[PDB]
Each structure stands twice: as structure tokens, then as C-alpha cells.
Amino acid sequence: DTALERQIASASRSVEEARRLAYHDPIRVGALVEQISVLADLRQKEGDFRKAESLYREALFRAQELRKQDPDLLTGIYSLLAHLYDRWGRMDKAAEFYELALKISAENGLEESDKVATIKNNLAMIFKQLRKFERAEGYYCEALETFQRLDGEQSARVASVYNNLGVLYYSHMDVDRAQVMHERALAIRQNLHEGQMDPADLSQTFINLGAVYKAAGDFQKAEACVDRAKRIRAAMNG
Amino acid sequence: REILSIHVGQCGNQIADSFWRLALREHGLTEAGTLKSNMEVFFHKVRDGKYVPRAVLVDLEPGVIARIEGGDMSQLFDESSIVRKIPGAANNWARGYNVEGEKVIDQIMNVIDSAVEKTKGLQGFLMTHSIGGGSGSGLGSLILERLRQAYPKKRIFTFSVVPSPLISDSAVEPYNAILTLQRILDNADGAVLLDNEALFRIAKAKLNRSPNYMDLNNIIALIVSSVTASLRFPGKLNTDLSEFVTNLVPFPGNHFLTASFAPMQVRTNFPDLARETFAQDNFTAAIDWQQGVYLAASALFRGDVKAKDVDENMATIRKSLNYASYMPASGGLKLGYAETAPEGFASSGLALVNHTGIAAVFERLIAQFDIMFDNHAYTHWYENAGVSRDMMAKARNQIATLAQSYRDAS
Amino acid sequence: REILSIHVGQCGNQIADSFWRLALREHGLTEAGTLKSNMEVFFHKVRDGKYVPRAVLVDLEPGVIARIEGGDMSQLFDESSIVRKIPGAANNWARGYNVEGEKVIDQIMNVIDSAVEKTKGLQGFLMTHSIGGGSGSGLGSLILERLRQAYPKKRIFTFSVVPSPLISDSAVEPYNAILTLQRILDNADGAVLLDNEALFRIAKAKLNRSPNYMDLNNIIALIVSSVTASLRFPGKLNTDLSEFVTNLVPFPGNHFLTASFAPMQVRTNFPDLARETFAQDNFTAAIDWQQGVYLAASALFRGDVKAKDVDENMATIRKSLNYASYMPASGGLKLGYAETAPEGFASSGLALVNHTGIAAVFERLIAQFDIMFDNHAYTHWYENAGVSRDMMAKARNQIATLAQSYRDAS
Amino acid sequence: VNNTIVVSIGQAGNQIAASFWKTVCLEHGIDPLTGQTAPGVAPRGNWSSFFSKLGESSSGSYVPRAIMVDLEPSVIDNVKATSGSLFNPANLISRTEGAGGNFAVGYLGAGREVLPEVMSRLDYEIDKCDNVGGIIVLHAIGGGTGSGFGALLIESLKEKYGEIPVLSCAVLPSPQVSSVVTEPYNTVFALNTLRRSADACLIFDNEALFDLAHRKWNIESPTVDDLNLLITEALAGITASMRFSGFLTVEITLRELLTNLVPQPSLHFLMCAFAPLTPPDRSKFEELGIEEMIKSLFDNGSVFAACSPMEGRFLSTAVLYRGIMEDKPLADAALAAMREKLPLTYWIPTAFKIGYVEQPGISHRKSMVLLANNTEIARVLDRICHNFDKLWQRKAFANWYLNEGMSEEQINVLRASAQELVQSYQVAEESGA
Ligand SMILES: Nc1nc2c(ncn2[C@@H]2O[C@H](COP(=O)(O)OP(=O)(O)O)[C@@H](O)[C@H]2O)c(=O)[nH]1
């Protein structure tokens, strides 16, 4: 009767429908994946991670059986398993599965894709947690360049990688480079107002700039940032 | 009390063509799935009329279901309750368990899980296969692991078909039993071992026609149904699936049951059905008899069988039987009834018999394993597909323990 | 309540082969016209068994009906309910409206008048054509004038097929729309604009087979039927043809409706059919979405659709939709039901949606008209066949008003 | 006995009345598919409140006092297929074109055409009545026919007779989603009539009637077969005092009901509620006593209305018990707690008009019906007044109302006349606070 049980019933039917559809027409694998992602999300929320894993493995087996191999699809499926492992707290496995995704893309054309830049960002973050700074920096830079070439410099995804690098540099106490990164993120994030970016990301940038300026000994600019973040978080109550 | 069913392997899916054409007859449904009794056990109520069965038709070599879902039975099974994948678990356990098993096992479990989250009283698994091939015994060994790891408090009944003692029918077949009979012994709560040598003979005496594996499976498909027809056609002495483990499995290893059917609309006066049920030639395995005493027999008498007769019939039968020394004088035989016979019959009988003779099936499959494993005689097909000799000798050391566990149970 | 039907042009008559093979299925008649529900709507009861439909198969290029009345459907249509004349309204509005239109329009009207004097409750005109060609759009523009001049108090529903945004399919085709969309805007009480780009895509996702204009029209032929199946399969919330003008047409110009069908015997559990019905990709037009808010949507759910679900489904859908600011919070969406699904389906859905996005269809057909008219780019085929540039720019100034009338309706 | 006509306008009113005369005939032991009773024996209860003796053979059909009016033919032809020779088919009037969410077709249009034929059948019923003391018009306040002709008919009936109650048992628009696109128009055009020329308008709301069959009658999808049975069982509950002359039946006529429930001439929009909402699956050991049905009468999700009843002021209340009661002092003392619990309006010291009917319901043995004249019923109509204004600042749909004969001056009057209605509870809320 619970709200979550209702969401699960709905998501299960929708998955079962996509399964049957892919029985009648084995090519429709992409849509099965999408429906699975919603149900897998819900299973994670209730803590059934093995069920979520089974769903993605099923998606993967269907993708693997295609007569025309779709590496982009496989890349995406592996990245969903990687993210599942990450939320599960299986940090090594998350890195392993993002790496598998990247290897499939590297062997086919897909080096400079949307998925690949995302994966490299997410993988870089796991490497930060593994305390492998150099590997984290490398992947973040690659994600950054790819998003630069795909979207303008003026995009949410570019600013997100800037932000993530900022936190990386800040956490290894490279204050100078942290500053550059967060300012570049600030510059972009100001120029992008609509539903293409929520204002809570803008507040994080000020928050992060605050800690960077404070670490730099500029306590003035630090408080100015912490202030503007507070103004933003307040202004989203209306 | 709604039993899921799994039909892995060509041997199991060919029983599924026999079983779900007998489950539709006993519940009185047409072949399409609609209504022409507890129908909730085998069948998921999708709509008001149509009853989709709780079966996965899990299979490699997808031509078996092409017989099923091509001719007359495509409307019955749900196609999100299936798996069809080439290659075909190449009569090779390591293909079925490891190579082409890990490709499908995420799809198998998430189709089981989409069939047991529609339940509302899940109790059992009538998982139907053989221990002979590579799909029924390889992927059948893999499902038993993953299903017990997912449902450790639910009874998993394996309805195996043993390799024939007569000849092989597959070259690497005594390897594929011991690699499977390990995982049945480790995971399944009770297995029914059936034998195509006995299924040939008893069907040869049944029909005035030389049998085929459709006619052999109707002996199995009644036994698959009669085990779980005191669960869905209640009657008196309601025997669920939880009572085939507590009553018939004394020690934690001795859970390999030898099931007969009788009579083999056919009526039988029933002082002779109990003599037909516990005929030594009507048991569906080549179990030992001159060096074999039972442990725990069962008797599920369905249809127009009234319970007064077993005080005179079955007490006479149990004196004729040979039990272990540690079983009581008139005890040792559980009973049950159903209030509805199978369609075509008017009074049936079943007998799950846990017996030391089934170790002679095990001793055959070890004496075949003894020569064949030490001389590497088909071993490299496992080694070059994931499964080493360490993993395979360890499979022997449990079955050599299991063949001793009945000899310790005499 | 007996709806006359007109099928002008090759596009309309090819729908008539699809529609009167679906109208015979939903009413359960054979292809000859006899009995194999209010059958009086589409069909004139000639004798006790045979039901002749209320269709004129008005056509130039008489090879389309030679397909119809040659193969399997010659016994169905009455041949005093037709017109076949060469030449063929040479993809040229002025041939279809003026040159070869005035030859047949005395025969068209006197065949309509011989079909509506057999009625006994005339309500509507499901006039089926395209706005692309010269027969469906030229003579379709002429029939709409003469039918409104003859029946000014009866609802004339035009079931058009817009030129594709993908490519032309005819050179002078953006001329032929605006010369027709004028007369639809002036005479017809509500038009359903359909698009062969969307009819390709939705049929591509429907069939595991590359479509053709017989398979495309079965999307149309259900929409042609589902609009007028709350009129003949009554059920609850009886929506006649008079309620597709009062409910869905707010301003006196905005009567060009974008109709979807769902599901695309097929059953659908129906919390997802409403998500399939009002899918943006299931609407059968290339309407605008990122700059488009609805005016008035409809939802005719036929078959086994019970009305309790729309309080949970359709109220959820209308929150997901984008209406104009001057439409209420949960309102703005009319509903209906039929007590009988189409044959082949078990629960269907329709959605006549009056939307500002259909002005992007109009804005395309003006932006094509803008370059093509000022440079005389096919104009002399109209000028040398009756229709001047004064008569053609005046056709633009209504559609440029009409493309503004949706932008005034945001 | 006090005869009472049930006029059934629109598709929404007919499909209630399709199910209403299913109930009432089964309630009087009369076959709802032939009109004839069981052969030789009299019908139970007092049949002549709603019925009429057709054929003096004591086994012939009893024609109900009911005219079914709708401009679409498919609704009454559904009733003619599902009533047999029960109704008088001279009263089962139908047309061809329909109205289709257009008030100005039912009011001034195709409904104007049927009005000489409809009123020539009310005159047939009323002259056939002994002395008629109420007219229960069943319609909706959402459509073009039920809200259109229902606004026409009631203003064509009190204008003609006037000494008779018109209880317009009507179905408001659900606020969750509008079943008509012009549905906040068509209400306000009917709130001219249902405020001015109707003595009371018993409302019902399709949102609350979904929740009271989903959460209470424990089914997944409540169809309109079960919306028109929650309404029916309430309409066959408020009319059990009219139709039954039993043991200690408090025989409440419509005027006898509305003198207790219409405080001053602009406060006669009444909600309703039913108890028990036990599903028909024979929950025999969970059948509710009188101390706890009244606890289930006055829940916020227990009235047949979109509004929350206990969040506003119950102005006049009429709890109509119906069935086998063992406990008269346990009755009315549960309401003594409910005099304290519920928000009442001093402006009235006490108001609980309590009907008993010993003849039990069909579905229930101890059934309770409420009629609370609430101040929250302006908050349902505050939504309708607001959804009108969003569709009048734009000057919504088109000419559709204006081409039929209405004027922009008239439409602004009827918005004000619905603003005069909504303020008339806002007058009566804070003065009743
Ligand atoms: N009872 C029965 N036994 C069968 C049937 N088909 C094959 N078998 C036996 O089952 C054994 C295993 O074959 P199987 O498991 O089907 O091969 P796999 O499916 O490729 O794993 C063989 O030794 C056959 O003798 C059948 O339909 N019924």
C-alpha cells in the first residue's frame, strides 16, 4: 500500500512490457535498458542491490546477443552497473566497471562521446576516493576537454568538471589550481540561468570558492562567497 | 502456496510440453491459457479468463521451445517467462554453468524474480531437468545455486532425469551428473531422480506402442503433478511441499527420491493399486533391491481413494517392503490424498521413496566417473571452459560421500 | 446520428480501403456487405442482410477504385455511390476545384443527396482526403464548399493528410494545402490533420516491417473510426460529433486537431495507455512542442476501459501536459468511452488534441508558400486553369491569420 | 402518499437514474427489468411515492415517476436495453445531435426543442400524482445537457408550479481533472439556476466518489457503474423516508427535508455522505455499530464532495438513519459528541434532522445517510469560480456560447450570480464562526 511499493509495481509492469516487446522484437534493447534503470533505482532505494544488479546484467546479456554489436549501448550498461556498485559502497568494483565501459568505447569509435566524458568524470571521482590523485586528475582533464569539444565552454557539464577538479585540487591542498577551477566554474555558471542549471549548483560553487579563498588567506572574499551562497539557498524558498 | 516452475534443458523443456499439457488438463483449462481446484499454484492469474503458468522455459539450443511456441502452445506461455540463446550449452557442464550460463543467469533470475514478486504465497520450485546434458545439468546446476542464494528458506524440488544405466546417450554424461548432483545435494531440498531405462520399460508395459520421449514424459508429468496435487487439490491429509523434506529426508544428504505412478477413464479397485504403486518394477529408477532397504516411503493417492482402505492395503504393503532397522514396525510411510484424480484417470497413486537403492545410481555414476576422470577422458572440455579438475574431483568427493551416506543409512 | 462519409482523392480513397475494411470488422460484417452495435451510422440498410456503406468514393484518376472494386470489395460499395472520371485533377488545385471539379460536383452532390435522403438522422461528414494533391485537396476543397452551402447546420469533419515536412512528395504541394486549408477553415467544423512523417514513424514502431500506405492508413482508419465510435458503440460519456466542435474548438478558427491512437487481441493494462495515448511521439503530426501549449485535448478510450482509472491516470496526464494559461487546472480535457474495442484490440485510445503546435504545420506551409508564391514558382498551372494570384494570396492571408490565431491562443 | 418525480437529465444524471431505479425497484421488491412485481403479492414499502399503477391486475408493471431527458440517443437507448418494459417509453425522451459541453445547446437550443415535450410529460406525471411534493432532478453540473437542460428544466418547472421542492441531485465537476473542457463554464451557468430556481442542489463530486469506492469499497478501478451506486445508495437513502411507512419511520418529505436544511434562500447546496462504506464482500463481523458509523460519517474523506467537510462549518445537518436499529438513546448521543466535535454554526443553535427508517437498505442492514449543508461547499465553488475567471480573462473558448444566443453581458451576470453564491457562504461562515 506504501508509496514505494506502488512505484515498484508500476516500474515492474513497465519493465515486463519492455521485456515482452524485446521477446517479439529482439532489437528493442535500448528501451528495455531505460525501463530497467527506473526499476533498478527503486530497488536500490529499498536496499535490494542484488535485484538491481540482476536487472542490469539482464540488460547486458540482451545487448551482448545483438547480431549487430552496439558498443555504445554496452558502454552505457557497464556505466549503470558501475554507478550501482558505487552507491552500494563497492568502490573497487565501480572503478572496474567504468574502466570496462571505457575499454569498449576505446576499441570502437567512441573515444570522444557524451557517455565517455561522463564515465571519465565519474571514474575520476572514484579514484579521488581511492586516494589516487594523479589518475583522478588525468581522467577529469580528459572529461573536461571532451565536454569542451562537445558542448561550448559555456555549458553545465564543463562547469561541473571544473567544479570536480576544483574539489580534487582543494582536497590535495593545491589551493592555486583549486581557485582557477572554481572561478572558471563560477564564470560559466553565472551565464546559465534557466532549467539548464538549477541554482543549488551555483551555491556549491560559492561554498567551494569560500573554502578555497579561506585556505588562500583571503578571508574577506571567503566570507563574501559564503554570504552569496546563503543568499541563494535562502532565495529558493520564495 | 503457489509453486514456481523452472524447465531448464532440452530434457526439462520437453517435460514442460508434457507437464503444462497435463497441468492444463487437471485444472481443466484449454491450451491457450483460458478457462475451459486451486488454480493459483501453477498459474498466474493475469486476467479474468486467461491463466499464464508460473514456468520459466529457460533453454539453450532454442529449437525445443520453437516446437512448443510454434505449433499449439504459443499463446499459453508468457514470452517474458523464457530464455532462448544460442549456442546451446554444448552437452558440457562448463558451457551450461560458466560459459553460456553466466550469459543467461541474470536473465533467468530476473524472470524468476518477476514471477515470484507476483506471489502472494510462494512455496516451492518444481525445477525440471536432467542431470545428463549440458543445459539441464549445467545451467540446472547454476540455477540451483542462484535460487538458493536468493531464496534460502523455500523448498527447491529438482525433478531430474538420470543418465541411463543401459547405455550412455551422451559421452561426457557421467561427468555432467556428478557436477550437478553436487549442486542438487548442496541446494535442493529434495530431488526426484527419474531414469529413462525405467521410463522406457514402464511406458512399454503401459502403451501397446513403442514409446518416445513425449510418451515417457507423461509418466514424469504425472509424477511432477502428483507430488504437488495434494497442494492444489486439497482433499484430506494435506501434504504440502514442506512435508516432502521433513518426512522423506531423514539425514541431511538423503534427499534423492524414487517416484512411481499407478495405475500403469482408468479405474482401479485399489487393493491392487497399492501393489502397483509399490511394485519394484513400477519405481522409476534402476535402484538396487537385493541390497536395498528403504528409508522413508510416501504414498499420495489421488482421486476416488478413500482412507479406510490404506489401513488394510498400505499396512499390508509396508510389511512387504524392506525398511531400515531404525524405522518403526508399521511406521515409516507417510500418506496423502487429493480430492481430484488426473484427467484420464479416476484413482491415481504416487510414491516418493527414499531408498538406499538410489545410491546404486550414485555408485554407477561414480564408477563411471572413476575411470573417466583419472584418465582425463573428456576433462579438457571443462578445463578449457572454466572448470578445473580440482572443482570436479571435489564434486566426486561429495557424491562418494553421498553414495556412502545411504550405505551408512542401512 | 448516421454519418455520411466522403473519400475524395487517391489519399482519401486509399484510406477508404482501410477504413471500410475496419468499419466492417468493428461492426462485424463480411467484405461483401452482409452480416457475418449501431450499424446505422456508417451503413445504409438496403436489405435484411446486406449493409451498403454511406460512402461516396469520389475520385479522379479512376485506378484507385479499380484496386478497390476489382479485387475483393466490388460487392460492398454501391456504384451509385461513386464517381470515376479521367483526367485526374492533375496534382493541381485548379484542375480539382475548377476544371475537372465542376465536371463532377453536380454528380458528387446528387450522390450525396441520394445518400442523405436515405437518412433518417444525418449528423456528420467524415470526409477523408489529403491537403496535398489535386484531387483530395482540390476537389476536397470544392466538396467542402458545396456541402456546407447545402447543409449549413451539419458537422463536417475533414480527415486530412498534411504534406510531409520531411520532403515534398509533390512539387506544387504547399500551394495545394493553403488553397485547401482555406476552405477547410471556412466550411469544416473540425479537421483532423494527419502527417505521413508521423504516420511513417509510429507505424515503424508498430510493425516489425517497413510500412506502406496501406499500413499507414490503418492508423488513420482507427482514428477515423475512434472519433465516431462513441457515436455508434455508445458506452458511457456519449460523445457525438457535435461535442468535438463545442469542446475542442475554442475560437472560431482553431479547429485543426492532432489525433493519436493507442495501443501502438492486444491488451493494455491502462495506466500506461494514457501515457501512450498522450505520448508526444504518438501524436500523428509534426506539431511543435518546445513552443507549444495545448488548447483542448480529448480522450476517447474504447473497449475494456473503466472510468475509475481516469481519475488517477488522466488527472496525472493533464498535469504532465502543457495547456494555455486560460485553461483550468484539472480541466481542459474532455473524455469519452465506447463499450466495444476495435477488432484486434481489447482497449483502445484516441486523443483529439487542439494545440498551438499545429500552427507550426501551418507556419511550414506558409514559409513554403512565401518563397514559392512570390516567385511564381508553380503559379501558372493555376492561372491557366482558372485560379488567379488574387484568389491564391487571399488563401494565404487566412492561413497567415490562422497561424497567428494559435499564437494568439497561447 | 407524497409522490416524487425523478427527472434524469444528461448522461450523468441518466446513468445515476439507470442505477437509481435499479435500486429503488429492487428496494420495493419489483423486478428492475420488467417493471412487474412478484406475481400476485404487493410490493414491499409504499410503492406509490415513486411509482404508478399501470394495469389494475396486481401483477402488471409499475411505471416509475421518471422522465429521462438527454439530447444524445445512446444514453437512454442503453437504458431501454437495460430496463425492458419498466419505464414509460413516452418519458424516455431522446434526440439525435446532443449538446456536447455547450450550455447554450441544452438551455437555449436542442434543449429548448425538447422543453415543450418534456413539460408535456411532467404534466402527465404530476396530474397522475396524488399530491406531488418534490422533484428530484438528476443531472451533472458539468456538461451541456445535464448542466444545460437541467438549468433550463428547473427554471421551467418552479416557474410553472412553484409550490414544489426541486432537489437537484447533481454531480459537480471533479477538481482533479475536468471531464469537459468547458466544465467550469457550464457549472457557473447552472449555478444561476441551481441557486435561484432550485430549492436545493444536492452535490456529488467524482473525485470523492472515486476515493470512497477505492479506499472504502476496496476495489482498484472504481468505474461509473460504482460511482452511480455510491450516489444511488445515497439517493436511495435520502428517499427512504419518502417511500416507507413502517414501524417508527420519520416520514421526511422533500419540503420536510429542506425546511431543516435550507436556512435562507441562497444556502441550499447540500453535500452528502453514506455509512457504512463496508464493501459488499459480506464483512459480517466487521459490520459497524451506530456509535462508529457516525465516526465514519464525518471523516474528511467520507463526504461525496471535493471539499474537506470538518475543515469548515456545518451549517445545517440531517443524518438519515435507515435500517434496523436496536439503540435509540445510543443514537443521537453519538451525535451529541458530534455536536461538540464538528464545526457547527451558531447562527444556528442546533441542527441535526434525524430520520429513522425501519426498512433496511439493499446493500446494508444498518445504513446511515448524511446531508450536511456545509460552508465548504463554497470552497468547491471557489475552484469553479476561479477556473471560470482564468477562462474569462482570455475570454475562452470562442463564439460557442455567444453564437447560440447568449451575450457577454449575460455571462458576466452569471459569474456574479455565482459570486453572489460563493459569498453567500462567506457571509455565512464568518458570521457563523
Ligand atoms: N525423460 C526424458 N528424457 C529425455 C528427454 N529428452 C532427452 N532426455 C534424456 O535426457 C538426457 C540429457 O539430455 P539434455 O539434458 O536434454 O541435454 P541438454 O538440454 O543439451 O542439456 C539425455 O541422456 C536423454 O536421454 C525427454 O523428453 N524426456
Ligand SMILES: Nc1nc2c(ncn2[C@@H]2O[C@H](COP(=O)(O)OP(=O)(O)O)[C@@H](O)[C@H]2O)c(=O)[nH]1
Ligand atoms: N496516409 C496516406 N497518405 C497518402 C496515401 N497515398 C498518398 N498519400 C499522400 O497524400 C498526399 C497527396 O496525394 P493525393 O491527394 O493522393 O493526390 P491526388 O489524389 O491526385 O489529389 C501525397 O503527398 C502522399 O504523400 C495513403 O494511402 N495514405
Ligand SMILES: Nc1nc2c(ncn2[C@@H]2O[C@H](COP(=O)(O)OP(=O)(O)O)[C@@H](O)[C@H]2O)c(=O)[nH]1
Ligand atoms: N457520477 C457520474 N458522473 C458522470 C457519469 N458520466 C459522466 N459523469 C460526469 O458528468 C459530467 C458531464 O457529463 P454529461 O452532463 O453527461 O454531458 P452531456 O450529456 O453532454 O450533458 C462529466 O464531468 C462527468 O464527470 C456517471 O455515469 N456517473
